[PDB]
Amino acid sequence: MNIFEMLRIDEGLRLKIYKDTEGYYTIGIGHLLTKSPSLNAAKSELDKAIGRNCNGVITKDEAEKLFNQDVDAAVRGILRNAKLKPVYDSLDAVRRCALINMVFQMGETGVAGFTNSLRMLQQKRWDAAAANLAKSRWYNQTPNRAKRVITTFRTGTWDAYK
Ligand SMILES: [Cl-]
Ligand SMILES: [Cl-]
Numbered sequence: 001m002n003i004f005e006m007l008r009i010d011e012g013l014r015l016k017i018y019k020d021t022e023g024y025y026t027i028g029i030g031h032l033l034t035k036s037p038s039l040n041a042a043k044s045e046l047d048k049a050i051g052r053n054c055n056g057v058i059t060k061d062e063a064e065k066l067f068n069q070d071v072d073a074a075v076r077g078i079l080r081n082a083k084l085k086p087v088y089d090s091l092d093a094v095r096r097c098a099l100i101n102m103v104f105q106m107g108e109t110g111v112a113g114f115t116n117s118l119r120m121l122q123q124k125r126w127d128a129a130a131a132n133l134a135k136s137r138w139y140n141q142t143p144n145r146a147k148r149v150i151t152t153f154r155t156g157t158w159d160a161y162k
Contacts, residue, residue: 001158003071003097007104009161010145013063017042017056021142027056028063030104031070074100077108084112090122098152106138121153130154 011030017039020026025033025042033045046054050062078084078099088099099121102111112118114136120129130150133139139146148160 001161003100004067006097006101006158006161007067007071010101010105010148013060015058015060015063017046027058027066029067029070031063031066070104071100074104074108078103081108081112083115083118084108087118087122090124092156094156094158095121095153098149101149101152126154126156 008029013029017025017027024035027033027046033042043056050058078088088096117129117132120132130153133150151160
């Protein structure tokens, strides 16, 4: 089990524009296109993204290419972030995947807002962090996926995903 396999489970694969759980125009493996209502604003972003006229449909390879970019982007943003970097540096390899998961999902800024939770992770207080993470809109909106992430943090194993 690796970060890619983990995210593929949590996000799905879709070859045609769709709306995310939040109403947003998305494609491939959890690749957000825009927060605008316009289906046209989405089709434009999408061609910009691919370098072709997609007319809202992409190939597997293309979805994978975007997936590589996003995971890379997520990892670099953590390493570049003053709040995130220390947490990540302090973590084991499994728990590190958990932090990348959250960042890919909610962006650097959002995750950086979980001040208390981050502090508890850094102090290796697994149970308490898992309890704090749960008290969020994130958890309330996408509970099954959040629970899987939370369990990964609490345990340090890939149980939730196997
Ligand atoms: Cl709450
Ligand atoms: Cl969910």
